[PDB]
Design a protein around this ligand. Sequence first.
Ligand code: ZN
Ligand code: ZN
Lengths: 138, 114, 147, 195, 134, 122, 134
Amino acid sequence: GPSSQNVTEYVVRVPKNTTKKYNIMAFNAADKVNFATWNQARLERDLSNKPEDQPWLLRVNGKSGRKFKGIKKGGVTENTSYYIFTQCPDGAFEAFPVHNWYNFTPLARHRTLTAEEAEEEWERRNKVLNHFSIMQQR
Amino acid sequence: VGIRFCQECNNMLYPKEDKENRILLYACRNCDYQQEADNSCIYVNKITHEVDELTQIIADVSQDPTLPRTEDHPCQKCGHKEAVFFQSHSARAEDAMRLYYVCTAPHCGHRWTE
Amino acid sequence: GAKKSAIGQRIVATLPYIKQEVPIIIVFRALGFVSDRDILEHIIYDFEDPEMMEMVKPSLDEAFVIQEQNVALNFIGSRGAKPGVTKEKRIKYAKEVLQKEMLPHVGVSDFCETKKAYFLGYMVHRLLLAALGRRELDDRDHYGNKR
Amino acid sequence: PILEFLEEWSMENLEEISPAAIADATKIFVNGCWVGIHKDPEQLMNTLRKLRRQMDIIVSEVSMIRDIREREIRIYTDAGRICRPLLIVEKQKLLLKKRHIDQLKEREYNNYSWQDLVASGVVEYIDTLEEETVMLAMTPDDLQEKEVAYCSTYTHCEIHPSMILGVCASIIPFPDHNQSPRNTYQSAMGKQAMG
Amino acid sequence: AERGELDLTGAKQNTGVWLVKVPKYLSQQWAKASGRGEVGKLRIAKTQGRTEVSFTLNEDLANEHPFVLQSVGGQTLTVFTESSSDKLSLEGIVVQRAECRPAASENYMRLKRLQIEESSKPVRLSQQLDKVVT
Amino acid sequence: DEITPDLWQEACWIVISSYFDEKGLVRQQLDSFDEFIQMSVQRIVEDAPPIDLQAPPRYLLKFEQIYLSKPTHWERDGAPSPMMPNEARLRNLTYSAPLYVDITKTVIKEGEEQLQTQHQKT
Amino acid sequence: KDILCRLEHTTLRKVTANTAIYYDPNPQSTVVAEDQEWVNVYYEMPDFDVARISPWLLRVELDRKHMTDRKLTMEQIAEKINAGFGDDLNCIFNDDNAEKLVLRIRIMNSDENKMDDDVFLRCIESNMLTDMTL
Ligand SMILES: [Zn+2]
Ligand SMILES: [Zn+2]
């Protein structure tokens, strides 16, 4: 049917200002993030300052779900820009400028060796064997 | 050969054996994640490494203007008479003298050796 | 040694203003790349190449002890030419080295760590290809390499 | 100007891609800084060369090197790169025609000069790195003749092979008829002579 | 309930969005004429095994841009926003990616030079002085 | 139409002669110094971080523009004179150009007021 | 040339083509299909490996040309391994008539019933391919 050869043209609209600034949040293909299971989520600035130009922390389902850290894209494009176009029933596209771009990486949740423990186990590097034992001991 | 990463922490999976059942398991260090291994081979290395450069040759070399071209070796897949020929270019080739050919025709990345 | 000969060749980075070369994986950890996949995706672009994979194995095993960026930064700072009197000074010192001293041409801004990881990933990749013999070693006499 | 131009040509920025894309695309480096990756390196290089020859956005001394077997495109804009002018060859024919020579003969009272050859895309500066990617004819009178068939893909041609010699070496007559140590000793004595 | 909580309705409703890359001059004209809401028209055409998209700028604003489409399977991209009321939300997932470029190229190299010239004006150079400062 | 092999020998020496008429031989020295003065000298002055001083009044010095006068010699009496290179070789002078920089000084005395003064051609 | 062959330092690295470490606890079901035809010959009348053996197994392939060029055969090599390591390494190998020379190694029954059982095979492999002299 016509769907195999359809052609359509829509007007482009660009609001002068919006109550919410648009940003891009990208995840790695191997993370296979799924938003259906995200019953709850938090996006907030990091606590390393304990700010506007500091990393962000993304947590899903509180402490029980996945955790991610969002880093702002350092390389700006002085000659290029990104826009998000959305489908609309009135026959006109609304375009939003990408104010920011954030790449998110998951943060593992487990008893990672502390700085003190790493300093202690580092000496083993000279003769360590059966690395599984180090985690089984810890 | 194939390397597996922990689905929980994306760290490397290391081979393990369950003394309880004696089957190979790929267990994640620092993560207590374990996966039923299927390959059964934990390591393999080829000392003579007689691997074919045809796997390493890139079809784009057909565009290099410094490579020689010959009309005597028409491509089997497309019949194009002009082909680009060159040597191994790998230090592991102890006898790096045989010629590898690449079809000069666009979108025909066929490679062979005489 | 049996343990050493079993792991083979391993990679170390001789960073600036640091007394002893740190294991390469510590720098990726210090740059904030946690999982081995996040690090290997920057070093090996074609996972279907098991030869490159076997080359990085010992580098991962040596750094296994360090699984946290702050721990990696503390480790780097601990070997710094100016030993930090505290973990916070050590981390800030290490952060300053990685932020300004390592690979300045790639960038010095707070978010250039991603570009530094790719370039450091590429430096390792070049080292792997050379050790695997897939690329010829660079020639010091080549005027293309001179200025 | 190069970095800004590459953004228009779909060069994907490293911070805007997944590592899985680095396998097939070619790495684009500017002054050794890895700027991004590109999916169609042949069209890109042709475009970069066309702009350099036209002097639109890329100055004559910028060198573009495409390492075909390594999927790398390196663009160097830095100083200190030694380079030299070479006549461009297309379809085994020199781009330099009699109209250029006639205009160069009538150099004075006409203001036509070397800069017009560069702007016309007739001659271009090749640096020692780009020379590795170049297939260079020694002379048009014999090297690009179809009967020789040694190479049918020359990219450039030397202006005169004697321009490989320096200032003191250019003073020797028939240096091609002397033992090489003798050309070296003369290059030293020429600096010690009197005049 | 927290200041960092994100309204996931955009994701829950599976809102699909298209990410498009455009030149700053193009977006600058659109931003200048943003109050008009008539910056141009976007045309989309699909066939049995091929599809094409292009944008046409309003004549009054200029005083054809085919789009190069890109696969979205290589990386999972999403769109989120931050409200001035300190409330975040997820607007949707990027289901299509494209880049806007003009159909013409030779004249575009000129327009690039025009942008480069305007961008080069701040490059201050040491001025030669005819007489010594007394 | 095209350069025939019998004309190439004459043609290539015409092209080369035009190259040396335009570029000359010492072009590497001259162009390298021209770039240094025109660009490198100015970039260094702008890239240097502005001097900030604190007592408490706050003072800031911003270097802003470089000017370079023709090589000038100052006689014992202090009269400046353009120095010709032959005079420099003969009188053992150093053929140097006076370098000047515009400096803008801003001072803040925590009194919601800032005083900005510019020292032209320092 | 026989004297030359006896003088030239020859190590297993020169005669082995490739090597691999497998996990197969049941020798009656060798993970390598080709070994099943010949390994069962040894397990038909097992000795020193009747009661127990390490499930970890190291397999080495020797180049017939490199072997014959040096006038070496699997017989003395197997004996040399057991001569050097003793009964610590149970060496089992296919008949010379096979299309490929194959040797299987497992740690002794009493060690399975000295650093490790699994990773130590890499030490053995690397050691056999470096310091062991035929
Ligand atoms: Zn894990
Ligand atoms: Zn073909």
